[PDB]
Amino acid sequence: LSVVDVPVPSLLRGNLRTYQKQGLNWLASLYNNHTNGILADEMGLGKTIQTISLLAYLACEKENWGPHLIVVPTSVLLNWEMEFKRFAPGFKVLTYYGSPQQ
Amino acid sequence: LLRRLKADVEKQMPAKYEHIVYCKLSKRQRFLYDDFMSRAQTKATLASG
Amino acid sequence: MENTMKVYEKLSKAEKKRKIIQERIRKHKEQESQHMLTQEERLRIAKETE
Amino acid sequence: SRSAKAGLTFPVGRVHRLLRRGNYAQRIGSGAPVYLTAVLEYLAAEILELAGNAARDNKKTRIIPRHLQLAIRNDDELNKLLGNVTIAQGGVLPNIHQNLLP
Amino acid sequence: PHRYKPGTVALREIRRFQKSTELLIRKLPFQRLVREIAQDFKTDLRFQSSAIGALQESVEAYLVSLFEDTNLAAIHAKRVTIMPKEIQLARRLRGER
Amino acid sequence: LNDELVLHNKDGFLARQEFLQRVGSAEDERYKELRRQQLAQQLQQDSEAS
Amino acid sequence: KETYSSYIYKVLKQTHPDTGISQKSMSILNSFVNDIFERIATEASKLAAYNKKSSAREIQTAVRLILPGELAKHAVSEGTRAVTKYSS
Amino acid sequence: SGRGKGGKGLGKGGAKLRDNIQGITKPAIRRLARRGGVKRISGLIYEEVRAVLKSFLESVIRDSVTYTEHAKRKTVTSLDVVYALKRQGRTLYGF
Numbered sequence: 118l119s120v121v122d123v124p125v126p127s128l129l130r131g132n133l134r135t136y137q138k139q140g141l142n143w144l145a146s147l148y149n150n151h152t153n154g155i156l157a158d159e160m161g162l163g164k165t166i167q168t169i170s171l172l173a174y175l176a177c178e179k180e181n182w183g184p185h186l187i188v189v190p191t192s193v194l195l196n197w198e199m200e201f202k203r204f205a206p207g208f209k210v211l212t213y214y215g216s217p218q219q
Numbered sequence: 220l221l222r223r224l225k226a227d228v229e230k231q232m233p234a235k236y237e238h239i240v241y242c243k244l245s246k247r248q249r250f251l252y253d254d255f256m257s258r259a260q261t262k263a264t265l266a267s268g
Numbered sequence: 269m270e271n272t273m274k275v276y277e278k279l280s281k282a283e284k285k286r287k288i289i290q291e292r293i294r295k296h297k298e299q300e301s302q303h304m305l306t307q308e309e310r311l312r313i314a315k316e317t318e
Numbered sequence: 319s320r321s322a323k324a325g326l327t328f329p330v331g332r333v334h335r336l337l338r339r340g341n342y343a344q345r346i347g348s349g350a351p352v353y354l355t356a357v358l359e360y361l362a363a364e365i366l367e368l369a370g371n372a373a374r375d376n377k378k379t380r381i382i383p384r385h386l387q388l389a390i391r392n393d394d395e396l397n398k399l400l401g402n403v404t405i406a407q408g409g410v411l412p413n414i415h416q417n418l419l420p
Numbered sequence: 421p422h423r424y425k426p427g428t429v430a431l432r433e434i435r436r437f438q439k440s441t442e443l444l445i446r447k448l449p450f451q452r453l454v455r456e457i458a459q460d461f462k463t464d465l466r467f468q469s470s471a472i473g474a475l476q477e478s479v480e481a482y483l484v485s486l487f488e489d490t491n492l493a494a495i496h497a498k499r500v501t502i503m504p505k506e507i508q509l510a511r512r513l514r515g516e517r
Numbered sequence: 518l519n520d521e522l523v524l525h526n527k528d529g530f531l532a533r534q535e536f537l538q539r540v541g542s543a544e545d546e547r548y549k550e551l552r553r554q555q556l557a558q559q560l561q562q563d564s565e566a567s
Numbered sequence: 568k569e570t571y572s573s574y575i576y577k578v579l580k581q582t583h584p585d586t587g588i589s590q591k592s593m594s595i596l597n598s599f600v601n602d603i604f605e606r607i608a609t610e611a612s613k614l615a616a617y618n619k620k621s622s623a624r625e626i627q628t629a630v631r632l633i634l635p636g637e638l639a640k641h642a643v644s645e646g647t648r649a650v651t652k653y654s655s
Numbered sequence: 656s657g658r659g660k661g662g663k664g665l666g667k668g669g670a671k672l673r674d675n676i677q678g679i680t681k682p683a684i685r686r687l688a689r690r691g692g693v694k695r696i697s698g699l700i701y702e703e704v705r706a707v708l709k710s711f712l713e714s715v716i717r718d719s720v721t722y723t724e725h726a727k728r729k730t731v732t733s734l735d736v737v738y739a740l741k742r743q744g745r746t747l748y749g750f
């Protein structure tokens with residue numbers, strides 16, 4: 118399928134249940150060709166773990182883990198920062214909300 | 220593009236059972252519905268505000 | 269005009285000296301900033317944050 | 319031109335037409351109909367120089383309306399000349415009472 | 421507790437405004453007031469927003485001039501708090517009405 | 518169900534709303550008239566004074 | 568429509584060659600010039616009605632009491648120099 | 656078809672608050688006061704300022720509307736306010 122599967126998901130709690138690894142290597146292939154993808158799978162099938170594992174692979178295989186953006190609806194604003202808090206915690210997460218002062 | 224339905228994960232997956240419940244109309248709410256609907260059909264079908 | 273243009277010349281001199289002072293400030297910040305994360309150091313900071 | 323031969327630059331003929339339309343007199347003084355334009359040119363030169371100085375003071379290349387505001391307001395003679403007229407998006411000179419300070 | 425004495429931030433905040441030059445009145449309630457005071461004459465007035473902006477600037481300028489004048493009239497007396505006496509005196513002195 | 522529906526709509530629910538809005542318009546017009554007459558009285562008094 | 572932006576622009580350019588302008592300030596200057604012109608011109612009209620009769624002396628005198636004297640002497644002197652330049 | 660009754664005749668077509676209240680607020684007046692340079696203020700100023708608006712805005716409004724009526728213009732433009740400001744002794748530049 119023109120995809121090379123070879124991950125090094127270090128500092129990642131848990132493991133993909135043999136269904137998100139294909140998504141991870143598809144995203145790796147998409148990155149390797151400098152393109153944009155659409156992870157439009159069925160709702161509830163772990164999109165967050167897929168993108169978390171993609172970012173972890175990018176941070177491990179490549180020395181680049183610069184400032185990335187997660188644009189999300191308000192309700193999941195906490196969930197995302199908890200999603201890889203329970204999962205791979207080797208990243209530094211920032212949450213942007215809550216009045217001008219803080 | 221990348222899409223995968225629930226066919227990829229089905230070994231342990233409870234199914235979905237769709238059910239439709241029919242509810243009647245109460246007397247005073249029926250009065251309200253008829254009044255509003257007749258007024259709307261008399262207004263929209265012809266000159267109005 | 270003469271008074272305010274002398275004031276403006278002093279303001280421009282202050283502008284230049286503050287430009288150079290923040291240039292050296294940025295230089296010192298770069299020297300004291302983190303360099304060459306490499307692999308082992310980046311994973312060390314990653315595991316501490318983990 | 320007439321302004322060039324006079325050393326002026328404001329369009330004298332436009333003001334002549336304006337005064338002829340205004341009918342402030344049947345036969346306006348044609349000995350020096352641009353003289354009333356000359357005095358206005360002098361006043362405009364004054365106000366433009368003051369505005370340019372004020373804009374140069376706060377490192378802004380373009381004439382801020384506030385810059386013109388302090389330019390006209392600083393001059394006591396200008397305030398006496400035009401003090402009953404306000405300027406859109408103007409301002410007030412910072413005037414804090416010394417005895418008010420703690 | 422980072423609580424400052426009454427008036428400690430007042431001078432700073434006065435400096436902040438008298439530096440600024442923006443619109444101090446919210447546009448929508450000013451529109452409401454203008455419509456309320458103008459509908460008493462004729463309907464279908466069809467105001468142009470530039471006009472209401474003009475009267476908004478006019479009224480704020482008149483009010484700040486008034487308020488600085490009453491500040492002077494109050495600092496006349498051994499008073500730093502403004503009361504109706506100064507406002508009435510400032511209004512009557514110039515003979516506005 | 519035609520006849521009772523027709524009767525109750527002859528009484529109607531929106532009819533009460535129309536009556537309430539008519540009363541509202543009436544008292545609003547009365548207030549506007551009072552405002553206009555008071556303003557006219559104030560204006561005539563002011564013109565007489567000056 | 569004939570605007571007056573060009574004249575004020577070139578006056579600013581001959582008194583400040585690197586200072587820009589703002590659009591609001593353009594209307595500010597236009598209104599200032601217009602209303603000063605009208606004010607001094609109706610002053611000249613009332614000064615013509617001053618004398619029991621139907622030039623440049625009227626306008627010189629009109630500018631001589633409308634604005635503060637310090638700038639008034641400069642105004643009249645430069646106006647006279649302008650008319651001397653324009654005479655021939 | 657002809658006998659009986661039912662709704663299939665479309666319709667004939669009939670018909671089916673303008674009081675308004677003053678605005679402004681205490682924080683706005685407080686900001687305006689701070690612009691005017693006052694250290695401390697009492698609790699009775701806001702009513703008087705509202706009175707100043709109710710005595711200042713409406714007069715220039717009446718003069719403006721009678722002027723634009725005298726101009727035979729069935730609309731109000733920003734330039735009409737300038738005439739009122741000039742005859743009121745407080746002229747505004749820029750419009």
Ligand SMILES: Nc1ncnc2c1ncn2[C@@H]1O[C@H](COP(=O)(O)OP(=O)(O)O)[C@@H](O)[C@H]1O
Nearest residue numbers: 131132133134160161162163164165166196200
């Ligand atoms: N590999 C995995 N290990 C443990 N839990 C998982 C895994 N993949 C998905 N989940 C669970 O599935 C749920 C899916 O939620 P989430 O991924 O946040 O958004 P979405 O519902 O859009 O996929 C999560 O609550 C997560 O706990």
Ligand code: BEF
Nearest residue numbers: 159160161162163
């Ligand atoms: F429930 Be899903 F994965 F959005």
